[PDB]
């Protein structure tokens, strides 16, 4: 058979024909070769389950052997799966920087990554500098931002500011960035974004051994437990250095702290495959974490 597949990066759409024996690795390799990406360790191919979950393709398995939702064409999103600890030291290629910028900016503008208003205005000004270059008055006259989506809806809704007021606040900062190259505006954006509480955190709905609703966060530095209505402030923090072991079986997951005296933290996921995906992200993040320290 010849199966039709689309892979979308943040700024490219690729249509492929594959065969039943094509592996995720072979699809991934063709994607990164087409776009010129060398820093591949951060990225993966996301898809929708037969039951509607967003998960990552296994590159060491056949594409059809995984339970990708049966549609034509098959739809994959080439996205960052792991985040660096410091964008300045770790994102060396310009394409890598731009793919992280677009993906992060998308999550900020769609309210998936919480951002307070003052930070949102400042981030928008660096995105403006990245798109328009230097603020020039022969080129940029009043209303030049009216067609740009610049701020998260949550920021708009709070605040009684009109569009022109938001655009003037952003314009003030845009003027401040005069002379900044477009790749430096992109990296400046990411330096601010990487300090946000929700940046680079994979959230999973989980439950206490009592049944209370919580969130688990998996990120580059370890695991966090959050209250149900506060994904900004971790209730309990488990950096890798403070974890003795982690285990899962079926739906149950257990974190043992480096200190026997300290109690185990026990939580439940809704499905076995969620626990597998949590652990896949723990192992990948733990692995990159150790690699940075060689």
């Amino acid at each position: 058979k010849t199966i039709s597949v689309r892979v979308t990066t943040m700024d490219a759409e690729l249509e492929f024909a594959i065969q039943p024996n094509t592996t995720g690795k072979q699809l991934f390799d063709q994607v990164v070769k087409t776009i010129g990406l060398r820093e591949v360790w951060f990225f993966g191919l996301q898809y929708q389950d037969t039951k509607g979950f967003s998960t990552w393709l296994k590159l060491n398995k056949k594409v059809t052997a995984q339970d990708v939702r049966k549609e034509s064409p098959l739809l994959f999103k080439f996205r960052a799966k792991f985040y660096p600890e410091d964008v300045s030291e770790e994102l060396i290629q310009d394409i890598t920087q731009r793919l992280f910028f677009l993906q992060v900016k998308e999550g900020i503008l769609n309210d998936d990554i919480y951002c307070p208003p003052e930070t949102a205005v400042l981030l928008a000004s660096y995105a403006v500098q990245s798109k328009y270059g230097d603020f020039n008055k022969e080129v940029h006259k009043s209303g030049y931002l009216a067609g740009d989506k610049l701020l998260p809806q949550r920021v708009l809704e709070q605040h009684k500011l009109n569009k022109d007021q938001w655009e003037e606040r952003i314009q003030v900062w845009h003027e401040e960035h005069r002379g900044m190259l477009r790749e430096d505006a992109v990296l400046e954006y990411l330096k601010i974004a990487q300090d946000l509480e929700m940046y680079g955190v994979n959230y999973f709905s989980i439950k206490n051994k009592k049944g209370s609703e919580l969130w688990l966060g998996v990120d580059a530095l370890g695991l966090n437990i959050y209250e149900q209505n506060d994904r900004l402030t971790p209730k309990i923090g488990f950096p890798w250095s403070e974890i003795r072991n982690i285990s899962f079986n079926d739906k149950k997951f257990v974190i043992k702290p480096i200190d026997k005296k300290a109690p185990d933290f026990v939580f439940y996921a809704p499905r076995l495959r969620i626990n597998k995906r949590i652990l896949a992200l723990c192992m990948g993040n733990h692995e990159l974490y150790m690699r940075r320290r060689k």
């Binding site: 700024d11 490219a12 759409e13 690729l14 024909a17 594959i18 087409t34």
Partner: peptide, 14 residues
């Protein structure tokens, strides 16, 4: 052998 074959491309500049 069974490498994927590129059939179409769209590039978004901005």
């Amino acid at each position: 052998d069974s490498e994927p074959v590129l059939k179409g491309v769209k590039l978004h500049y901005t």
